[PDB]
Write a protein that binds this DNA or RNA. Structure first.
Length: 1240
RNA sequence: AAUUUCUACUCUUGUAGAUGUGAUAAGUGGAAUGCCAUG
DNA sequence: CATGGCATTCCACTTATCACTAAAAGATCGGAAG
DNA sequence: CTTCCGATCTTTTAGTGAT
C-alpha cells in the first residue's frame, strides 16, 4: 500500500543560492588598501583576452589531427538506414554500438592509439595529448611539439601574467576536455562528426543521387555551377557526393568550402550573386514546368553542415567593412555629405527628371524587373502596370498570350508606351513622387549631423537621412541604362554618372545599420580571487588556510570570514573554541570526505610508491603515513582496481559482459572488506562511525554501497569563539568579514521569507545538523559588480556590491540519480485508479488554459490564465512584443522579454502546484516537436510553448511548500519529487514521473460531444473534376421543413482519396447545416447558431481578412438563385450536381469546407468558439457559446480537455499494463477510435 | 515603488510568488540590406 | 506587395555538457651539511 | 667556499549504475 507522500528522498538535486555580502567593520578599508579588486579585474580582462590564444593551440591540433583521418563509413550508414526503416530497440542498440565504435575510432587519433598510423606518429600524438590539460600549455613544453602556432611576444608576456595561477584555468580545462572526448557528449568533436554532420551528409548524398536518377539535365547544371564557383576542382560533382569523400569535411576549411558550394558565393552590394545548389534547385522549382512539378514531389533542398566546435568560419563571400566608433561613422557621413553637395547631385538630378517631360520617351527604357516596384509605388496594387502592358500587347496583336508574356517578363520597355498605357495618372504620379524623393534628399542633405550616438533620437535621425538617400538610389535604379536596347546618349551618360555618385551610399547604409544595432555596453560583475588560486573551492578544516573561506553564525545572522595571505604566505590564523555561554560567533566546522569511488583508490591504490612497488615485486606493501595503523595492500587488491582493461572485476559491467556473477560477488566482497579496513585505518575517517553499514555480502551492487556510504562521511559541527578574538582579527587585517544578506534578514520583515532563504535556514537548522538532508557544497565563488517614506528606484544599482554564489545539495541521503522512477510512479498510479488529471494547453490567443478531469472525464474546474491576481499578462506580453518589433525596425534597443515571461510563469507555476497538491492529480502536456515550437516562436515570441516545460520539470524536481512545517513531507528537509531527474530534452522520454507527454494533433478541431473530426484534407481537390468527385461520395442531402436545417449524410467507404486516411469508428456521419437563428446562453446574451468565420480568398491566390458566414442562408440563397426547390424535403444533390456550372460547384465546396471548420476564431471581435457540424445522437448540435459548464467554453479549453482525455487513455492502458510501462506514443487512429468509443 | 535576481502589488523603511550559479560550445529564430526568380 | 532560395551584419534566445574538491604530486626555496 | 634537504605553495587527480 503506497501513498502520494512516499515520493520524497528519491534522488539528489543541486541548487545554487545568491546573496549580497555586506562588509563588516573596517574590512571595506582593509580591502581597498590592498587593491585586490583591481587585481581581479585585470586578471579577468587578461583571461578574457588570453582565452582565444589558447584556442589557437586547440584549433591547431584539431586541424592537424583530423587531416590524418581515413575511415570507411559504410557500416555507420548501414546502421543508420536499418534503424531508419523500422524503429525497434535492438536496431537502436546496434546504431548506438556503431556510433560508439566510430567515435572511439576517431578519438584514437587524438589519444594516439589508432592502428592506421605509425608507432612514432602515435607516440608523438600521445605526448601532445597529455599536455593540453595541464600547465605545459603555458610553459611551452607542449607548444614546441606543434611549432606552427607561432605566438609572438605580447601573448608570451601576458602568459607570464598567470604564473603560479594555473588552477584558474581548471574549469577551462574541464571545458576543453569535453571537446576531445568520446562519450557521446554533444559539445565533443567526434560526436559532432559521427551524429551531427554525417547523417546530414548521407541525406545530401541520397537526395543528390535521387535527383540524378529522376532527371539527368541538372548534372550539367551542377558541374557548371561548381566550376563557376571553383571549389573541389580536382574531383567530380558525382564524387563529391560520395561516402569516401567524407574522409574530408572534418576540418572547418573543407566544411566552409562545402557550405559555400551549396549556398553560393556572394559579392559586394549591387553585384550579381553567384548561385548555389539550393538556389538553382529553387530556380528550377520556380519555372513551374512539368519537370518543376517532378522535383516539387521529391525533397528539393540539401542541408548545410554544422560548424566544427573550436574553429571559426571563413567565407569566400564579401565581408563588409565595419565602423568602429560613432565619431568615425559621423565624420565619414559628414565628409560624404560634403562631397555629395560639392559635386551637386540634386541639381543635375532635378535637371535630369524635368527633361523627361520634354524628351523622346521612346529612347528611355525601364528595367523589366523593377516595373513591379513602380506599379506598387504608383498604384494601390502591384499588378496594375504589368496588367496594362499585358492588355495593350494583346490589343496590338494561345501562343499570342505566351508571346505577350515572354516579351513582358524579360525585355526592357520604353517609357513612352507605358505613359500611353496608364494614361496621365502615372505621369503626374511619377513627377510627384520624384519631387517628394528629391525634397526628402534635399532636406536630409541640408539638415546637419548630431555630435554623437548616445541616444536613440540621434540614431533615428541618422537612419532617416540614410534611407532617404537609399530611396533616392532606388529611384535611380528604375531605369535600364544598358546598350542592348536603344537609349539617348547624353541621357545615359548623365544617368550613369549620377548613379555612380549615388553608388557608395548603400554600403554606407549597411555599415551604419551594422554599427547602430550593436548591443549597448553594460557593466558586468567578475570573479574575485584575493590572490588565492583556490579561493572557496572547499570548506574543509584542513584546507581552510588554503581555500580561505569560513562561515560564522551570530544569533541568527550569518557571517562569512575570509582570511588573506599575510605577506604572500599562508599564515595559519587559529581560534580557540570557548564555552557556549561566552558571547561570540559560531564557526562551522566542515569535516567532509569526497566520493569514495573518487577518493579511496587515490589515497590507497593509485599512489606512485604503490605502483612502483608492485611492478617490481609481488610482495604486499604496508602504508603508514597518514594512517594511525599501518595499512597493507595485497597484489590482487591492487589488481582489481588496476586490471589493464576497462571492466574492473568489481564493476558490474564485467559481470554483464562475462556473466561470472560468483566471481563478481567475490571480488566485490573483498573490495568492500578492503575499503572498510581503509575507512577504519585512515586518519581523517577513523573517527567516523560505520556501524550503520550492512555486511559486505549483503550489498547488491557497488554503486548502492557508495550511495549508502557517502552520507556518513559528511559532518558539520559548531564551535563558539570569543567575540573579542574575531573583532581583533578583523581590526588587525588578518580576516575579512562579510555578512550573508538578502531582503529576508532585514529587521522590518514580517511576512513569509523567500524559498532560498528557507533553504538556507533549513540547512543550518539543528535537525539537519543531526541528520544531513540538505548538504552545503564547495566551489563557492565571489563576485564584485561595480556601480551601474523615502523610496528610491533601482536602489540596488546605486552602489558597488559584493555577490556570493554558493551551491547546495538537497535530498542528500538519497542517491545521486533515481532508479526506476517511472515504474514507481506507475505503481502508485495503478494503486490509485481514481487519480484526477490536469491538462495544460498553450496557445497564442490565450496563453494557458487548464482543465481538470476525473477518472470518468467530467470537468471539475476549467480556467484561463491570461490573468493571475487581476493582472492580464497576455496584453502586457503582446504590448512588449510589438514594442520590440517597432524598436528593432527603428534601430532602437531591443531589450529583453525573458523577465516578464518569467514573472508570468512564476504565478502560473504556483497555480499548477497548488492545484497539484490540492487534488493529487497528474499533469499532461502535448509532445511538441522542436521545429513546430521554433516556428511558432518565430511567428510570435509572445507565446510560451518553450521555457514552461523546463520550469515545470525544475519545480517538480524538488518542491517545497513554504507554509508546510520543515519536518513534514513537502517541507524544506523533505521536498517532494514528482518528475524524473531532468538530464536533457533529447533523452527525456514520453513520461517524466507524474507529468506526461501526448501527441499534439486532433485535440482542438474535434467534437467534444461526439468525437467527430473533419477527415477531408482539402489539398486533394483543386479542379472541378476533383471537386465533383468529392461531391459524388456523399450519400444524400435534404431539407428538414420542421426545423429549417439541412441534413447531409456521408460514409467513409467513399471519397477515400480526399480523406486523410484515418477511418473513424462511426461508418456514417450526419452533417447538419443549422438554421442561422439566434439563441441565448446561460448568461442571456444572443448568439447566432451555425455561424462560421472564413478568410477572404476571392482573388483566388491571396488571403484577405475574416468574414462571417451563415451556411443555411447562403445555401438557400444559392439554391433559390438556381431555382432548385427544397421545401419538398427531397434530395438536393442530384438536382445540384446535374448543373455543370463550375461556380456552383466551387461555392458548394466552399460551403462544405466552411461548415466543417469547427474552429471559429477572430481576434478583432475577441470571439473564439467551437460549433459541431454533426448533431449529437441526443438531438443536439453542440455549440460552445451556450456556456454550459459541463462542456468546454473555448477552443483552447477543448484542446486542454482532449489532451486530458489522451492522458486518461494512457492511464487506462497503464492499468491493464502488466509490465507497468506505457505505449510508445499514441497513433491518431487509436486516439480517435477510443474517443469515438467513449462518445458512442 | 523598495528586491541575490525577476515579476505583480504598495498596509508595513515593505507584501505575495518564483529563482542552478559559473565556464564553455553549438544551434535556432527574427530584423534590415542586397542578388536571382514566381505570383 | 507578397512569396521562394541564398549571402552579410546585428540582436535575443534555447540546448547541452562540465565542476560543485581534499589530498597526493610536484615545484621551489631558504636553511642546513662536505 | 660548495652542495643537499624539509617546509610551503601550487597543481592535478582520483572515478560508480539493475536478474
Amino acid at each position: 500500500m503506497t501513498q502520494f507522500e512516499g515520493f520524497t528522498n528519491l534522488y539528489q538535486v543541486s541548487k545554487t543560492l545568491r546573496f549580497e555580502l555586506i562588509p563588516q567593520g573596517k574590512t571595506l578599508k582593509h580591502i581597498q588598501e590592498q587593491g585586490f579588486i583591481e587585481e581581479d579585474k585585470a586578471r579577468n580582462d587578461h583571461y578574457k583576452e588570453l582565452k582565444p590564444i589558447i584556442d589557437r593551440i586547440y584549433k591547431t591540433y584539431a586541424d592537424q589531427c583530423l587531416q590524418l583521418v581515413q575511415l570507411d563509413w559504410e557500416n555507420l550508414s548501414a546502421a543508420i538506414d536499418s534503424y531508419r526503416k523500422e524503429k525497434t530497440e535492438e536496431t537502436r542498440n546496434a546504431l548506438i554500438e556503431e556510433q560508439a565504435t566510430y567515435r572511439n575510432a576517431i578519438h584514437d587519433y587524438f589519444i594516439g592509439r589508432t592502428d592506421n598510423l605509425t608507432d612514432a606518429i602515435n607516440k608523438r600524438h600521445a605526448e601532445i595529448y597529455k599536455g593540453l590539460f595541464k600547465a605545459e600549455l603555458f610553459n611551452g613544453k607542449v607548444l614546441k611539439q606543434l611549432g606552427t602556432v607561432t605566438t609572438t611576444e605580447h601573448e608570451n608576456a601576458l602568459l607570464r601574467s598567470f604564473d603560479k595561477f594555473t588552477t584558474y584555468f581548471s574549469g577551462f580545462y574541464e571545458n576543453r576536455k569535453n571537446v576531445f572526448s568520446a562519450e557521446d557528449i554533444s559539445t565533443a568533436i567526434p560526436h559532432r562528426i559521427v551524429q551531427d554532420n554525417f547523417p546530414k551528409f548521407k541525406e545530401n548524398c541520397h537526395i543528390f543521387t535521387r535527383l540524378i536518377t529522376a532527371v539527368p539535365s541538372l548534372r550539367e547544371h551542377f558541374e557548371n555551377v561548381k566550376k563557376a564557383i571553383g571549389i573541389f576542382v580536382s574531383t567530380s560533382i558525382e564524387e563529391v557526393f560520395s561516402f569516401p569523400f567524407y574522409n574530408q569535411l572534418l576540418t572547418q576549411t573543407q566544411i566552409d568550402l562545402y557550405n559555400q558550394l551549396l549556398g553560393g558565393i556572394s559579392r559586394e552590394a549591387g553585384t550579381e550573386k553567384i548561385k548555389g545548389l539550393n538556389e538553382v534547385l529553387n530556380l528550377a522549382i520556380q519555372k513551374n514546368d512539368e519537370t518543376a512539378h517532378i522535383i516539387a514531389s521529391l525533397p528539393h533542398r540539401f542541408i548545410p553542415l554544422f560548424k566544427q566546435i573550436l574553429s571559426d568560419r571563413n567565407t569566400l563571400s564579401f565581408i563588409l567593412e565595419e565602423f568602429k566608433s560613432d565619431e568615425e561613422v559621423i565624420q565619414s557621413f559628414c565628409k560624404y555629405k560634403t562631397l555629395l553637395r560639392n559635386e551637386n547631385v540634386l541639381e543635375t538630378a532635378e535637371a535630369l527628371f524635368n527633361e523627361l517631360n520634354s524628351i523622346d520617351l521612346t529612347h528611355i527604357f525601364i528595367s523589366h524587373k523593377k516595373l513591379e516596384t513602380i506599379s506598387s509605388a504608383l498604384c494601390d496594387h502591384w499588378d496594375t502596370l504589368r496588367n496594362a502592358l499585358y492588355e495593350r500587347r494583346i490589343s496590338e496583336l494561345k501562343s499570342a498570350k505566351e508571346k505577350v508574356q515572354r516579351s513582358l517578363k524579360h525585355e526592357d520597355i520604353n517609357l513612352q508606351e507605358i505613359i500611353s498605357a496608364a494614361g496621365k495618372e502615372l505621369s503626374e504620379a511619377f513627377k510627384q513622387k520624384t519631387s517628394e524623393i528629391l525634397s526628402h534628399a534635399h532636406a536630409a542633405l541640408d539638415q546637419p549631423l548630431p555630435t554623437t550616438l548616445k541616444k536613440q533620437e540621434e540614431k533615428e535621425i541618422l537612419k532617416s537621412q540614410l534611407d532617404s538617400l537609399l530611396g533616392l538610389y532606388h529611384l535611380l535604379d528604375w531605369f535600364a541604362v544598358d546598350e542592348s536596347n536603344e537609349v539617348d546618349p547624353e541621357f545615359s551618360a548623365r544617368l550613369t554618372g549620377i548613379k555612380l555618385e549615388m553608388e557608395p551610399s548603400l554600403s554606407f547604409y549597411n555599415k551604419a545599420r551594422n554599427y547602430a544595432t550593436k548591443k549597448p555596453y553594460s557593466v558586468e560583475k567578475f570573479k574575485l580571487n584575493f590572490q588565492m588560486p583556490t579561493l572557496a573551492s572547499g570548506w574543509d578544516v584542513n584546507k581552510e588556510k588554503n581555500n580561505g573561506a569560513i562561515l560564522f553564525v551570530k544569533n541568527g545572522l550569518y557571517y562569512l570570514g575570509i582570511m588573506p595571505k599575510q605577506k604572500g604566505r599562508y599564515k595559519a590564523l587559529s581560534f580557540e573554541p570557548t564555552e557556549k555561554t561566552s558571547e561570540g560567533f559560531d564557526k562551522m566546522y566542515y569535516d567532509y570526505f569526497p566520493d569514495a569511488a573518487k577518493m579511496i583508490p587515490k589515497c590507497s591504490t593509485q599512489l606512485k610508491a604503490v605502483t612502483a612497488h608492485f611492478q617490481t615485486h609481488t610482495t604486499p606493501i604496508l602504508l603508514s603515513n597518514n594512517f594511525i595503523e599501518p595499512l597493507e595492500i595485497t597484489k590482487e587488491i591492487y589488481d582489481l582496481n588496476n586490471p589493464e582493461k576497462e571492466p574492473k572485476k568489481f564493476q558490474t559491467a564485467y559481470a554483464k559482459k562475462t556473466g561470472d556473477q560468483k566471481g563478481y560477488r567475490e571480488a566485490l566482497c573483498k573490495w568492500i572488506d578492503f575499503t572498510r579496513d581503509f575507512l577504519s585505518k585512515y586518519t581523517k575517517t577513523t573517527s567516523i562511525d560505520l556501524s550503520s553499514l550492512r555486511p559486505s555480502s549483503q550489498y547488491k551492487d557497488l554503486g548502492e554501497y557508495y550511495a549508502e556510504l557517502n552520507p556518513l562521511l559528511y559532518h558539520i559541527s559548531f564551535q563558539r569563539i570569543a567575540e573579542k578574538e574575531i573583532m581583533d582579527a578583523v581590526e588587525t587585517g588578518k580576516l575579512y568579514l562579510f555578512q550573508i544578506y538578502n531582503k529576508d534578514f532585514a529587521k522590518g520583515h514580517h511576512g513569509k521569507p523567500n524559498l532560498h532563504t528557507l533553504y538556507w535556514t533549513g540547512l543550518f537548522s539543528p535537525e539537519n545538523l543531526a541528520k544531513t538532508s540538505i548538504k552545503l557544497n564547495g566551489q563557492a565563488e565571489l563576485f564584485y559588480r561595480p556601480k551601474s517614506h523615502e523610496i528610491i528606484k533601482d536602489r540596488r544599482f546605486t552602489s558597488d556590491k559584493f555577490f556570493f554564489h554558493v551551491p547546495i545539495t538537497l535530498n542528500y541521503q538519497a542517491a545521486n540519480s533515481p532508479s526506476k522512477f517511472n515504474q514507481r510512479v506507475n505503481a502508485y498510479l495503478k494503486e490509485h485508479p481514481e487519480t484526477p488529471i490536469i491538462g495544460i494547453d498553450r496557445g497564442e490567443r490565450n496563453l494557458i488554459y487548464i482543465t481538470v478531469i476525473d477518472s470518468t472525464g467530467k470537468i471539475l474546474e476549467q480556467r484561463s490564465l491570461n490573468t493571475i491576481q487581476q493582472f492580464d499578462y497576455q496584453k502586457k506580453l503582446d504590448n512588449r512584443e510589438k514594442e520590440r518589433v517597432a524598436a528593432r525596425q527603428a534601430w532602437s534597443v531591443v531589450g529583453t522579454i525573458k523577465d516578464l515571461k518569467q514573472g508570468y510563469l512564476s504565478q502560473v507555476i504556483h497555480e499548477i502546484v497548488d492545484l497539484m497538491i490540492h487534488y493529487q492529480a497528474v499533469v499532461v502536456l502535448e509532445n511538441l516537436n522542436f521545429g513546430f515550437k521554433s516556428k511558432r516562436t518565430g511567428i510570435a515570441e509572445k507565446a510560451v510553448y518553450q521555457q514552461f516545460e523546463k520550469m515545470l520539470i525544475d519545480k517538480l524536481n524538488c518542491l517545497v511548500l513554504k507554509d508546510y512545517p520543515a519536518e513534514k513531507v513537502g517541507g524544506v528537509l523533505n521536498p517532494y519529487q514528482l518528475t524524473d531527474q531532468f538530464t536533457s530534452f533529447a533523452k527525456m522520454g514520453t513520461q517524466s514521473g507524474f507529468l506526461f507527454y501526448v501527441p499534439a494533433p486532433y485535440t482542438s478541431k474535434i467534437d467534444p460531444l461526439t468525437g467527430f473530426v473533419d477527415p477531408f484534407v482539402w489539398k486533394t481537390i483543386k479542379n472541378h473534376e476533383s471537386r465533383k468527385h468529392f461531391l459524388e461520395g456523399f450519400d444524400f442531402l435534404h431539407y428538414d421543413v420542421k426545423t429549417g436545417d439541412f441534413i447531409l449524410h456521408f460514409k467513409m467507404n467513399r471519397n477515400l482519396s480526399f480523406q486523410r486516411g484515418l477511418p473513424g469508428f462511426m461508418p456514417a456521419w450526419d452533417i447538419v447545416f443549422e438554421k442561422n437563428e439566434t439563441q441565448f446562453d446561460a448568461k442571456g446574451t444572443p448568439f447566432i447558431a451555425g455561424k462560421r468565420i472564413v478568410p477572404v480568398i476571392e482573388n483566388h491566390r491571396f488571403t484577405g481578412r475574416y468574414r462571417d458566414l451563415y451556411p443555411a442562408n447562403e445555401l438557400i440563397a444559392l439554391l433559390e438563385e438556381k431555382g432548385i426547390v427544397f421545401r419538398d424535403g427531397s434530395n438536393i444533390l442530384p438536382k445540384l450536381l446535374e448543373n455543370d456550372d463550375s461556380h456552383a460547384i466551387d461555392t458548394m465546396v466552399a460551403l462544405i469546407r466552411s461548415v466543417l471548420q469547427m474552429r471559429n476564431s477572430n481576434a478583432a471581435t475577441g470571439e473564439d468558439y467551437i460549433n459541431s457540424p454533426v448533431r449529437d445522437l441526443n438531438g443536439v448540435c453542440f455549440d460552445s457559446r451556450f456556456q454550459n459548464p459541463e462542456w468546454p467554453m473555448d477552443a483552447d479549453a477543448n484542446g486542454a480537455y482532449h489532451i486530458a482525455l489522451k492522458g486518461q487513455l494512457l492511464l487506462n492502458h497503464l492499468k491493464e499494463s502488466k509490465d507497468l510501462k506505457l505505449q510508445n506514443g499514441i497513433s491518431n487512429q487509436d486516439w480517435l477510435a477510443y474517443i469515438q468509443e467513449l462518445r458512442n
